[PDB]
Amino acid sequence: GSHSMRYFYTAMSRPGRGEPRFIAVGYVDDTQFVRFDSDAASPRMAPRAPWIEQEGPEYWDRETQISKTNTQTYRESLRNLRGYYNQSEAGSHTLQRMYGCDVGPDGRLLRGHDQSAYDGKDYIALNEDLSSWTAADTAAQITQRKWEAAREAEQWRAYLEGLCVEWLRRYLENGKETLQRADPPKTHVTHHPISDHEATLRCWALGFYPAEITLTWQRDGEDQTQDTELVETRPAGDRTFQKWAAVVVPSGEEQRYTCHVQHEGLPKPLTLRWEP
């Protein structure tokens, strides 16, 4: 039902190796659809999904210019941030920003987001009100003061409630055969003896989209959270995702264990067992 659009900016300094690299990537849900990289032979916002290719030159020109402007702004920002933390000119540092909008089945705004991090630590975030900020430390308070003075929150609210939702809706229509199609996991349980008295049961979910999924093991109907090995959801490379959950069980007790799968592509949760 619900959908999100997100942009991810990464600016990385690299003293002695040129000016900071700026990359911007845009997603609808788990589908990347645009990318800009300041290191490219010829930097421009470029399509990464077929449904965005139909946008005209005016579109690509706007996005390229914004991204070239950002390349410069984020460089100046990294210099400011180095100063705020009294850091050496010799070290490399990273500034990240993630922003965008969430909409429900009816296409209406659920909420907007704009958050930044410096060297992997939260730095400043636009609050859910789209009008005020939460600064992580005294450095970020300096940024907050600048942003307040520049009426940045007003600009973000206008974007998040306006263009963000409008264009997300347009993308969802233009890419409706994929963006609005949930592919359910293909599920199966494998069995791997460890010893004469224990075996691993591994419950697999393959070929699903979007990435969000829940895989849990129960023993006699009791959840096995602490005793489950759950790998991170990983991309297959064909838009879909994979995940598994494993539990070590006493030999001959395999039928007491059930794997439970929830995915938006499934009408009702699935229960599976090892089928020898």
Binding site: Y7, Y59, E76, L95, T143, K146, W147, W156
Partner: peptide, 9 residues
């Protein structure tokens, strides 16, 4: 479509 350019940090 992209968000708005704005204040340096």
């Amino acid at each position: 479509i992209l968000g708005p350019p704005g204040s340096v940090y």
